[PDB]
Amino acid sequence: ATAISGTFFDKNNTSADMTVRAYSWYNLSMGYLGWTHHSNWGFVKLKKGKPVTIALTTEVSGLHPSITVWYRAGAKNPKTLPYMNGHAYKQFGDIYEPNAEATPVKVGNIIMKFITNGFDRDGMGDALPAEYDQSQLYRVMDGVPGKLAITFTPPENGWYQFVVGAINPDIDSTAYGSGPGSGAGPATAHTVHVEVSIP
Ligand SMILES: [Ca+2]
Ligand SMILES: [Cu+]
């Protein structure tokens, strides 16, 4: 496992500004993975059965925010929350790292059950490049570039661990910058505003 910086949310702290790289959720290398540390992580404790919405917005021209939500099952001490199983992540699918260790600390079993994901597909044009042709990378349109909402109903009480990033910045836009490079794009950190609607 590897430590991450988490932003925690609750009923009195429903919003945050997170900073992410333009390609952070979908690098153009390898297996087209997100970069754990180029993205930004949130945590929120939720009650079973009541729908939740997370809304992302950005002012950055060309930027398309994105998000993956997992349920962090069996989490015990909250100080064991801000870890990930590695420096890269698949945008969908479940994560399992039994008896996980990081920097040494013992984190316990990391069990992350996939809940939902989405990315802002408004403004990307008539067709995305073929590198993005994975069905479970949920393309969502609300008619507003730079805005995204996801929803889910917590299947279990407890901690929901989510990553915010961005994907496929518009060619030659501010967000695109110098382009994908080696796959991670520019190191520029762009602000995405996050609002969690806790029931
Ligand atoms: Ca949108
Ligand atoms: Cu990393």
Residue numbers in the entry: 28 to 130, 136 to 231
Task: Quote the study's own text.
A copper repressible protein, denoted CorA, was previously identified from a particulate fraction of M. album BG8 cells. In the present work, we show that CorA is non-covalently associated to the M. album BG8 outer membrane and exposed on the cellular surface, contrary to the previously assumed localization to the Gram-negative inner membranes. Furthermore, both endogenously- and recombinantly expressed CorA were purified to homogeneity, and inductively coupled plasma mass spectrometry (ICP-MS) analyses demonstrated that only endogenously expressed CorA binds copper, one atom per molecule. Moreover, our findings substantiate that CorA and its homologous proteins MopE and MEALZv2_1030034 play an active role in the copper handling/uptake, which again is necessary for providing copper to pMMO required for its methane monooxygenase enzymatic activity.
Native CorA crystals diffracted to a resolution of 1.6 Å. The asymmetric unit of the CorA crystals consists of six molecules forming two trimers. Consistent with the CD spectrum of rec-CorA, the structure contains mainly β-strands forming two β-sheets and random coils and very little helical content. CorA contains two metal ions, which by analogy to MopE* was interpreted as calcium and copper, and the latter confirmed by ICP-MS. The CorA copper-binding site closely resembles the mononuclear binding site present in MopE*, i.e. the copper atom is coordinated by two histidines, one water molecule, and the tryptophan metabolite kynurenine. The geometry is distorted tetrahedral with the copper ion almost at the base of the pyramid formed by residues Kyn62, H64 and H114 and the solvent molecule at the apical position displaying geometrical similarities to Type I (blue copper proteins) and CuB copper centres. The distance of the copper ion and the nitrogen atom of the kynurenine (2.9 Å) is considerably longer than what is usually considered a copper-nitrogen interaction. The kynurenine is, therefore, not a first-sphere ligand, but the ring amino group is close enough to be a second sphere copper ligand. The Ca2+ ion is bound in a somewhat distorted octahedral geometry with ligand-metal-ligand angles near 90 degrees and with metal-ligand bond distances of 2.3 to 2.4 Å. Our presumption is that the conserved Ca2+ binding site is important for the stabilization of the structures of these Cu(I) binding proteins.
